[PDB]
């Protein structure tokens, strides 16, 4: 009774915290943690993963966010909005003594039917792959502050994924470990660019290394270049004053030989995850080797795939077969800093996006906003179909669920219809956020959809219920199915819990 009432409310609360960010008239959130760290964003997953939620139900609603984010990438604000709907609706049904088991089944059945509908009303991406995908990329950018440059960012998002996308069984596959995305402040948004290669935010380890190497043999280590001290308690015993220099020379030789090995195998560049001893640094430098250090592991992998290298952790056995390849490696100043660009990679299905923003917190959102597009054009590409956005498909699923409800009649039907009303949350939010009258738009929305206008959504700019695919607001089918999936799974969980104790 109460545990439930309390849970449902706590949950709905989180939903609302995110509702206002849905769509093109979406608003953003400012989040300041304990440490005073500020995150000003629109990305609902971030807003959620960020906020300080305590109520267990609230944590469960947030569990939704991350999961929707995980599988698809776009639609976490959507998933949350629906989970609140379903919960707020079940709240009504619960008052009429409808058993939470009935509500859970009904919700489950409606959900199933909802995904079917999306498949039905979906549309295979035809030969318009280019402009279709572009239209998708843009709609994504429309909610984010990146809208400012949605045209350029969308082209970049489209270009980047198209590049790393392998069309195998007449079907595409996109490995994101082929798209390196870096953010560097001190440039306008429009300045964001696509760099064929893998940019690493690291400069050469020593003043004397060259600023550019052409036709580079990239040696990738996952071990530091330093003298190896044995595993056993080892001690040097000097009884003759002469031995002192002999020992010191031997230690320098060991390092001078590590460099020799890497060099002997034809390595031109040495990118290591670990540290490079200062003396070893001298040697590489002297050998004319461009070497970076303490590089990010994630980056290490990307350089691997790109250059066809192998991450050697046993320098003594670094073979020529272990060398990556790139047309040229060069240190370039990206504004204030110096970055290392490995261009002309052996594997051309590897590319980088350099997000530019005048300010830290600005470029940070810019980076989040783009990742959202990538995930979209990618998810779309893979799926192969798309659905009309702007609440059209929601209004559609809402429409079809009211029918199915009449078929699978009973108390089940009450739950199925509420599920419909809940899905309608999207059009309401979208309208609300712009300024449109929810109840009026929703009524007109229902009309058109009743009359079989499966693509009539809310053009939040004109306030009219137009053709969403026409005006170009479209989204990958994958986004919609999960949101409804993650959303109903939260509602059902919270809905079975009749007591919460410690």
């Amino acid at each position: 009774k109460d545990a439930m009432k309390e849970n449902i409310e706590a949950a709905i609360a989180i939903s609302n915290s995110v509702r206002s960010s849905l769509g093109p008239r979406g608003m953003d959130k400012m989040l300041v943690d304990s440490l005073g760290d500020i995150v000003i964003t629109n990305d609902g997953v971030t807003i959620l993963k960020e906020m300080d939620v305590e109520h267990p139900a609230a944590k469960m609603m947030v569990e939704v966010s991350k999961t929707q984010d995980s599988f698809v990438g776009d639609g976490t604000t959507t998933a949350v909005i629906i989970a609140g709907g379903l919960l707020q609706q079940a709240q009504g049904l619960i008052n009429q003594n409808v058993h939470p088991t009935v509500i859970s089944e009904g919700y489950r059945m409606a959900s199933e039917e909802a995904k079917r509908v999306i498949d039905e009303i979906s549309t295979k991406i035809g030969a318009d792959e280019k402009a279709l995908l572009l239209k998708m990329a843009q709609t994504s950018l429309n909610s984010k502050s990146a809208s400012v440059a949605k045209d350029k960012l969308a082209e970049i998002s489209y270009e980047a994924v198209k590049s790393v996308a392998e069309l195998r069984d007449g079907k595409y596959y996109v490995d994101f470990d082929n798209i390196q995305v870096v953010k560097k402040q001190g440039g306008a948004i429009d300045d964001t660019q696509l760099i064929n290669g893998i940019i690493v935010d690291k400069e050469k380890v020593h003043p004397g290394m060259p600023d550019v190497v052409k036709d580079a043999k990239i040696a990738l280590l996952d071990a530091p270049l330093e003298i190896k001290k044995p595993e056993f308690d080892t001690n040097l015993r000097i009884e003759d004053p002469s031995m002192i220099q002999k020992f010191l020379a031997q230690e320098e030789n060991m390092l001078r030989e590590m460099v020799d090995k890497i060099k002997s195998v034809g390595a031109n560049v040495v990118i290591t995850q670990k540290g490079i001893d200062d003396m070893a640094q001298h040697y590489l430098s002297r050998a004319g080797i461009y070497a970076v250090r303490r590089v990010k592991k994630s980056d290490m992998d990307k350089l691997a795939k790109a250059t066809g290298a192998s991450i050697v952790s046993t320098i003594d056995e670094i073979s020529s077969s272990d060398l990556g390849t790139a047309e040229r490696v060069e240190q370039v100043k990206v504004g204030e800093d110096y970055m290392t660009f490995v261009t002309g990679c052996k594997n051309p299905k590897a590319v980088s996006i350099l997000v530019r923003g005048e300010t830290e917190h600005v470029v940070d959102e810019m980076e989040r906003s783009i990742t959202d597009s990538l995930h979209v054009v990618a998810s779309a590409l893979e799926d192969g179909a798309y659905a009309a956005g702007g609440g059209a498909t929601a209004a559609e699923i809402a429409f079809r669920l009211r029918s199915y409800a009449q078929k699978i009649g009973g108390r089940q039907q009450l739950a199925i219809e509420k599920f419909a009303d809940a899905i309608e949350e999207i059009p309401r939010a979208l309208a609300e956020n712009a300024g449109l009258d929810p109840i009026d738009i929703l009524l007109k929305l229902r009309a058109e959809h009743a009359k079989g206008n499966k693509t009539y959504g809310i053009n939040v700019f004109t306030g009219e219920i137009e053709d969403m695919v026409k005006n170009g607001v479209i989204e990958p089918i994958r986004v919609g199915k999960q949101a409804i999936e993650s959303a109903t799974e939260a509602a059902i969980m919270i809905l079975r819990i009749d007591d919460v104790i410690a």
């Binding site: 206002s20 953003d28 040097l236 000097i238 200062d278 504004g335 005048e358």
Partner: protein, 503 residues
């Protein structure tokens, strides 16, 4: 946590405040602020970025406005006050459009339109010129509201000269790596005593008294390592079983330092600049050899020196061959003030110079340095861009006039938004005036008309006590600074405008 109206108006209120904190430092008749911490203490400056980096901002939103000064500074050098004041005004002007019902987003879209548009008008009305004559002008203006004395013309000239002495030309365009200009300072009272050294100055003394007071036609060896007794990475112990050996071991040490010095002499090097330490026995023999050595040289410097003299930074003295030694006609220690400093002049590479700043107090030298940097940065930019703008409210007044016209040629809501950006731009003229102590409103009224009649270059003439021809007075704003200021401001203003709930 604050939602909607509360959050927003509150946010605009925050930005506005931080923005006024620096407002009075704008322009010639600017004032200074005095920030005092807990230990270091008193810092007195006119620099926008400084007054803010040092300022203890608490409110998140205010911290964001501060971010633009740090960016403006590190990215473009001049304009930190402007970008802050402007962000404050765009957020403020928006608060009206907000109350009327206009949606934050469309406002954000108006600012886009507006700024993108202004980003063209200025580039349209920008005035090309790269002659020292105007480079000197950019300088004079960059040093205005700052406490530099009456020497500005002298300082302007040093800057133009330093920039020109390091400006290189590549595939047709001129590049000016400001890193080749080493600026330093030393308390000695003067400001006029600011020397322009055609070389690299190092705030360091020679390590040992008997070392040559000066070295002509110097072969310079830059050393990464410390000329000291090193120990093997694997723990070692020495077991003496014979009393005799106790001395032998003490000698190995000596003979070790002797050889280090020997390697150095063998290379031909007569000047040793060591990034790390130097042992007293090493010093004994470097001196005996007559080599001018300097220890614990700053890596930053080790690098400039490497570049200026053409030397290679070597760690292992075994790879200290004549091939990696740098060149300088003279390496001489000279007492600048209370301090002795090492002067490296006649470097193999001429595109490396210094500006040894003098001035007294201490508090005066630091700021004069800060002023000279703004000047160096903008003169450099201008050297590359070859374009500039009419200073003192001029550019703004024009942009405002044109933008208010472009506004009409735009939709309903967005127009309102762009008219707002037009007004925000007038904040600069108004400010320069206010500080000067003149009448904002009339100044603006008069400035509008003159610019309207086509007088692009009529700015706020503090001398004429009102408006005037900036062309004549030679007040010129570098292009790159205006644009980054405008773009930075719009991006950050938009960021804050969308925040409807702060938690």
């Amino acid at each position: 946590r604050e939602q909607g109206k509360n959050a927003q108006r509150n946010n605009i209120e925050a930005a506005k405040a931080i923005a006024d904190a620096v407002r009075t430092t704008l322009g010639p008749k600017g004032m200074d602020k005095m920030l005092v911490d807990s230990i270091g203490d008193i810092i007195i400056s006119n620099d926008g970025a400084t007054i803010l980096k040092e300022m203890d901002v608490e409110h998140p939103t205010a911290k964001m406005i501060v971010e633009v000064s740090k960016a403006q500074d590190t990215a473009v050098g001049d304009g930190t006050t402007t970008a802050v004041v402007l962000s404050g005004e765009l957020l403020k002007q928006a608060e009206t459009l907000l109350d009327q019902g206009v949606h934050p987003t469309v406002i954000s879209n108006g600012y886009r339109l507006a700024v993108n548009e202004a980003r063209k008008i200025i580039d349209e009305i920008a005035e090309k010129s790269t002659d020292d004559a105007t480079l000197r002008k950019i300088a004079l203006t960059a040093l205005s509201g700052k406490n530099t004395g009456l020497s500005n013309d002298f300082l302007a000239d040093l800057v133009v000269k330093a920039v020109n002495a390091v400006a290189e030309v590549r595939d047709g365009k001129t590049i000016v790596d400001t890193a080749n200009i080493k600026v330093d300072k030393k308390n000695g009272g003067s400001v006029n005593d600011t020397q322009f050294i055609s070389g690299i100055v190092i705030d360091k003394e020679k390590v040992h008294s008997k070392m040559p007071d000066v070295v002509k036609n110097a072969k310079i060896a830059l050393i990464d390592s410390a000329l000291e007794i090193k120990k093997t990475e694997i723990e070692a112990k020495v077991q003496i079983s014979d009393p005799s050996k106790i001395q032998d071991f003490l000698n190995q040490e000596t003979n070790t330092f002797k050889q280090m010095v020997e390697k150095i002499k063998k290379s031909g090097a007569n000047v040793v600049l060591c990034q790390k330490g130097i042992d007293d026995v090493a010093q004994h023999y470097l001196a005996k050899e007559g080599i001018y050595a300097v220890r614990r040289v700053k890596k930053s410097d080790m690098e400039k020196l490497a570049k200026a003299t053409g030397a290679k930074i070597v760690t292992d003295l075994d790879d200290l061959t004549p091939s990696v030694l740098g060149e300088a006609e003279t390496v001489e220690e000279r007492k600048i003030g209370d301090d002795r400093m090492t002067f490296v002049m006649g470097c193999k590479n001429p595109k490396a110079v210094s500006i040894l700043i003098r001035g007294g107090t201490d508090h005066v030298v630091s700021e004069v340095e800060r002023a000279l940097n703004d000047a160096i940065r903008v003169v450099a930019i201008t050297k590359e861009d070859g374009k500039f703008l009419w200073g003192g409210g001029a550019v703004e007044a024009e942009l405002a006039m044109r933008l208010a016209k472009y506004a009409n040629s735009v939709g309903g809501r967005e127009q309102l938004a762009i008219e707002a950006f037009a007004k925000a731009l007038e904040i600069i003229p108004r400010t320069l005036a206010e500080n000067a102590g003149i009448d904002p409103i009339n100044t603006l009224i008069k400035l509008k008309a003159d610019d309207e009649k086509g007088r692009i270059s009529v700015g706020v003439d503090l001398d004429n006590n009102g408006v005037g021809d900036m062309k004549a007075k030679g007040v010129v704003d570098p292009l790159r600074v205006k644009t980054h200021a405008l773009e930075s401001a719009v991006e950050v203003a938009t960021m804050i405008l969308r925040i409807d709930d702060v938690i």
